[PDB]
Write a protein that binds this ligand. Structure first.
Ligand code: FMN
Length: 476
């Protein structure tokens, strides 16, 4: 096959495999960090929500994505578990991708070579080679690769610390029905001495049977993919919860670091949850960075698929939209991260303003219907005319929230109760007769601000955000 179509399948499966690892990481934090901390009674229900935030919703998004990928790929969840049951040193590489990168490494392999998964994936296997390695043996391996055939040799490899060990290595291509090589299987039998006669004859049989089991394990993965963009184009516009999480990931990380230094009983309980072999010895504070990494990873991946997809291909159109949505999703994420002050205010409103009786729960620190990331504009006391009722209003870029006190200082806590249904600014007009008039089509509202300088701040900000909303709605 042409290198273009070859690279195309390589990047399509780069999307699928990395998503598998990612979704797996999300479920880990919920399993061995979230649920334990909630039932540990070490922290309050409020402190826990500051860290994970909407972590649960992040899983619901990607699981919906991963499932769609698996059905198209005719896969099942078994791949990770099936591969883990093979307790041998092995890696899988992708010859379709430049420099033949590693896409998977067994637990035995990682511990043998003293490297971590983050150091390994995406790189060529030549880091094992050293000074006392027979370069003639290496060339035989390269030839077997270029000729797309299996091979079995012995050579000296090095760990991360530089420890020497003999490597009874076996290479084996992974072919589909059409015989096209999709992956390469590399099994390593570590030893102290060069094996001969019976010692060699036994080791060869094991590492070869090991390779066959991997081919069976990766049987669902090896098949080629026709289309993948239509799935990404339908799932990416539903990656909204990332905007909230990534805007609060900084405060969530600062909470962990602070609570650790002021509570020794908390520090030990966290590390006893990072013990789990699925954590690979990385702390909880390192998992929090992953959602921000994944959303910035998507545009890089999709573009690689798009660049290796011709114009006449039916998947080219969907990949265009997918790239657009991925970049739009990524942009709104970076906007929320930068506007830190706006993020603190929206989350403050979330906790102190009780909004109930709605068809859907109100999340202030989220995306609007049309304008994107919600932005707080103005707040203050508002007195309704002819009633003079003490009300407290919150003005946003998309709607106005009226409440009643039962301002943004974290220590100061006071309760706000929702007064009426959120008045959206896509259907309101504002004129002047500290009294100002807003014109809703259905009902009439006449409010009186604290002062003259206040009502001018209301009228201006409401009108400006309204006109921006109206003209945005007129686009389509
Ligand atoms: C699946 C696979 C597994 C490999 N495993 C090893 C290995 O364990 N040790 C090693 O020295 N080379 C291994 N190689 C070979 C190297 O990745 C590399 O291709 C080889 O050393 C030739 O390097 P060169 O391109 O600089 O000539 C493996 C290759 C493949 C495709």
């Amino acid at each position: 096959l042409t290198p273009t179509e070859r690279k195309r399948q390589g990047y399509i499966h780069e999307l699928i495999v990395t998503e598998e690892n990612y979704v797996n990481d999300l479920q880990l934090v919920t399993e061995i960090f979230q649920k334990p901390l909630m039932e540990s009674e070490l922290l309050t229900e409020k402190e826990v929500a500051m860290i994970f935030v909407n972590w649960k919703e992040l899983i619901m998004c990607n699981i919906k994505l991963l499932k769609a990928l698996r059905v198209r790929k005719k896969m099942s969840g078994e791949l990770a578990t099936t591969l883990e049951r093979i307790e041998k040193n092995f890696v899988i590489t992708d010859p379709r991708l430049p420099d033949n990168p590693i896409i998977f490494a067994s637990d035995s392999f990682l511990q043998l070579t003293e490297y971590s998964r983050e150091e390994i994936l995406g790189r060529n296997c030549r880091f094992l080679q050293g000074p006392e390695t027979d370069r003639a043996t290496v060339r035989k391996i390269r030839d077997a690769i270029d000729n797309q055939t299996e091979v079995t040799v012995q050579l000296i490899n090095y760990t991360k610390s530089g420890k020497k060990f003999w490597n009874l290595f076996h290479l084996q291509p992974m072919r589909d029905q059409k015989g096209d090589v999709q992956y390469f299987i590399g099994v390593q039998l570590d030893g102290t001495e060069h094996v001969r006669d019976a010692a060699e004859r036994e080791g060869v049989m094991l590492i070869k049977k090991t390779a066959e089991n991997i081919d069976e394990a990766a049987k669902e993965l090896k098949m080629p993919v026709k289309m993948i963009g239509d799935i990404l184009s339908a799932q990416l516009p539903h990656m909204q919860p990332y905007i909230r999480f990534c805007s609060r990931q900084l405060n969530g990380a600062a909470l962990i670091q602070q609570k650790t230094d002021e509570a020794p009983d908390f520090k030990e309980f966290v590390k006893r949850l990072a013990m789990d072999p699925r954590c690979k010895g990385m702390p909880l504070s390192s998992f929090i960075l992953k959602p921000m990494q994944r959303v910035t990873r998507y545009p890089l991946i999709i573009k690689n698929i798009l660049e290796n997809t011709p114009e006449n291909h039916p998947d080219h159109s969907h990949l265009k939209h997918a790239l657009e949505k991925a970049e739009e999703l990524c942009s709104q994420v970076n906007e929320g991260v930068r506007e830190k002050e706006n993020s603190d205010r929206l989350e403050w409103i979330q906790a102190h303003v009780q909004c109930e009786g709605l068809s859907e729960q109100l999340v202030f620190n989220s995306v609007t219907n049309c304008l994107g990331p919600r932005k707080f504009l103005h707040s203050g006391k508002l007195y309704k005319a002819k009633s003079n009722k003490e009300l407290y209003g919150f003005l946003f870029n998309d709607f106005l929230l009226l409440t009643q006190i039962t301002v943004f200082s974290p220590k100061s806590n006071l309760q706000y109760k929702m007064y009426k249904t959120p008045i959206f600014l896509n259907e309101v007009l504002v004129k002047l007769p500290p009294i100002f008039h807003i014109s809703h089509i259905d009902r009439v509202y006449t409010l009186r601000a604290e002062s003259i300088n206040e009502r001018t701040a209301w009228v201006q900000k409401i009108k400006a955000a309204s006109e921006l909303y109206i003209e945005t709605e007129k686009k389509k």
